[PDB]
């Protein structure tokens, strides 16, 4: 053969390289037909409102409203404090804060020690 292509999360498997495209069962055919039927029903519903001469405004889209609701208002009703959520919350909320506090405190203590012994030159630092 030839050197294999390895899919990744950011460079995925192309359809023509996917083994499932070559072993197709009759139930896979029925699934594809049902998907086409759902898509055609949605398309017909959209095109009926779209081509209506006596419609003015925006064709409200339930999928869009569901998407915007799930991303904003459904999250806390379905959040649970678990080891994963609590570990992640502690790490990402509190971790950077104390990391940056340590960095800045170390830097400023070094600066202040230099200032006390006059080892930091500020010959033309009159604007602060």
């Amino acid at each position: 053969s030839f050197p294999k292509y390895k899919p990744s999360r950011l460079a995925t498997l192309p359809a023509t390289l996917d083994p499932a495209e070559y072993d197709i069962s009759p139930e896979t055919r029925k699934a594809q037909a049902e998907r086409l039927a759902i898509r055609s029903r949605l398309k017909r519903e959209y095109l009926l409102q779209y081509n209506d001469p006596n419609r003015l405004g925006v064709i409200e889209d339930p999928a869009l409203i569901r998407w915007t609701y799930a991303r904003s208002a459904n999250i806390y009703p379905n959040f649970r404090p678990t080891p994963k959520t609590s570990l992640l919350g502690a790490l990402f909320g509190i971790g950077p804060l104390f990391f940056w506090y340590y960095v800045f405190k170390t830097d400023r203590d070094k600066k202040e020690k230099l200032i006390q012994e006059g080892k930091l030159d500020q010959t033309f630092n009159i604007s602060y």
């Binding site: 995925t12 959209y46 959040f79 959520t85």
Partner: protein, 62 residues
């Protein structure tokens, strides 16, 4: 297929394949041709990150 119930607040929102919009068919007649989206069809949770102005997951030659 929903996201796993791990306390992250996904609820029953379907977990669709993590495929960018650039991977959609450009020769199809989308209701939204630029976003390559059809009206009423389920929107991926990560739509605003996988738009063609943004992160691309497209298969590569290498």
């Amino acid at each position: 297929e929903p996201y796993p119930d791990d306390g992250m607040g996904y609820g029953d929102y379907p977990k669709l394949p993590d495929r960018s919009q650039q991977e959609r068919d450009p020769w199809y007649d989308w209701d939204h041709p630029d976003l390559r989206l059809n009206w009423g069809e389920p929107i991926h949770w990560d739509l605003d990150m996988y738009i063609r102005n943004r992160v691309d997951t497209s298969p590569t030659p290498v």
